[PDB]
Design a protein around this ligand. Structure first.
Ligand code: EHU
Length: 136
């Protein structure tokens, strides 16, 4: 297999900035204790591609999580805050667009390359949080 555009996401990433994440978690429905502990965390994100399968791992003092998926194909995901969601991830003009559905609710997580950073935008019902990662 040759190179793919999504190889731009591959690597080891560390959180360097976070904005409005507590308000995003509130809108998602995360409880007080989980919001406080999750808000302290500085995750490392490890992204790899093998054939059609993309794997995103998050390692932190709060939780270690991992998803593997094929673009456009729905999968089960247990989130760091212990939601059991149905997830679909697609590539839209270079942006990984991740929709999570649960309990009649929906949230969208976008992952984009900007300069040498990986920018994550989390959106729920008018509330956005921006989390910026740099290469580890
Ligand atoms: C609603 N709850 C919630 C939602 C998103 C989280 N994290 C991320 C998810 C996707 C892409 C990126 C991130 C990131 O963390 O940037 C976390 C979280 C996961 C691990 C540690 C801390 C928070 C939590 Cl709890």
């Amino acid at each position: 297999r040759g190179s793919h555009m999504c190889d731009a996401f591959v690597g080891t990433w560390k959180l360097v900035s976070s904005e409005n994440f507590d308000d995003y978690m509130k809108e998602v429905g995360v409880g007080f204790a989980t919001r406080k502990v999750a808000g302290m965390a500085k995750p490392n994100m490890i992204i790899s591609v093998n054939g059609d399968v993309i794997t995103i791992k998050s390692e932190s003092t709060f939780k270690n999580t991992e998803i593997s998926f094929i673009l456009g194909q729905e999968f089960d995901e247990v989130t760091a805050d212990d939601r059991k969601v149905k997830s679909t991830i697609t590539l839209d003009g270079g942006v990984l667009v991740h929709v999570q559905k649960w309990d009649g609710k929906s949230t969208t997580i976008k992952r984009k390359r900007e300069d040498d950073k990986l920018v994550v935008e989390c959106v729920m019902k008018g509330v956005t949080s921006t989390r910026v990662y740099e290469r580890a």
